[PDB]
Write a protein that binds this ligand. Structure first.
Ligand SMILES: [Cl-]
Length: 184
């Protein structure tokens, strides 16, 4: 039958796989984990599977309570294949424009619903895009700004320090700093 796609996304090898939990929040960021079909294109040290993700999370003494997947370009992993049964939500975040208001609303709604169902624990919301940096950083910071009243640059700096890489997209940064609070 037909060939599946298995290309390593551009620059994916270049980022630390998993960030630190952001203190004062229940967010953690990471780049997309890659299922086994991708690994023949990777050296052993470059591999980062869904198992590796759960192992790194456990290593940091945390636990994921929800994964939010922002990716759309290819199939990277099957939620059915997550070696742990953790709730999963896709929110396609497409293109380089500032994530649209419909997308921002879906992200807040997912986070708020998670927190409401999980007041009694410290499980985290794991968010990933391809690099777990730009679309991920935007949405996490936009949440902290609109919902928790965090100063935009404080959100960015906390996101960056915990991720291990700085949010790159200049239009994302400018909207976080100077754009409107979106309706909740
Ligand atoms: Cl993507």
């Amino acid at each position: 039958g037909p060939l599946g796609s298995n290309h390593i996304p551009e620059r994916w090898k270049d980022y630390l796989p998993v960030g630190q939990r952001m203190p004062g929040t229940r967010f953690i960021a990471f780049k997309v984990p890659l299922q086994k079909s991708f690994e023949k294109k990777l050296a052993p040290e470059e591999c980062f599977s869904p198992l590796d993700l759960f192992n790194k999370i456990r290593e940091q003494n945390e636990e994921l309570g929800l994964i939010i997947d922002l990716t759309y370009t290819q199939r990277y992993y099957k939620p059915e294949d997550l070696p742990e049964t953790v709730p999963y939500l896709k929110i396609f975040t497409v293109g380089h424009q500032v994530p649209d208001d419909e997308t921002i609303f879906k992200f807040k709604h997912a986070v708020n619903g998670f927190l409401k169902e999980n007041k009694d624990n410290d499980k985290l919301i794991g968010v990933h895009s391809t690099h777990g940096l730009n679309r991920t950083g935007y949405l996490i910071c936009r949440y902290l700004i609109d919902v928790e009243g965090v100063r935009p640059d404080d959100a960015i700096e906390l996101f960056n320090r915990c991720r291990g890489h700085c949010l790159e997209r200049q239009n994302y940064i400018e909207d976080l700093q100077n754009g409107p609070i979106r309706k909740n």
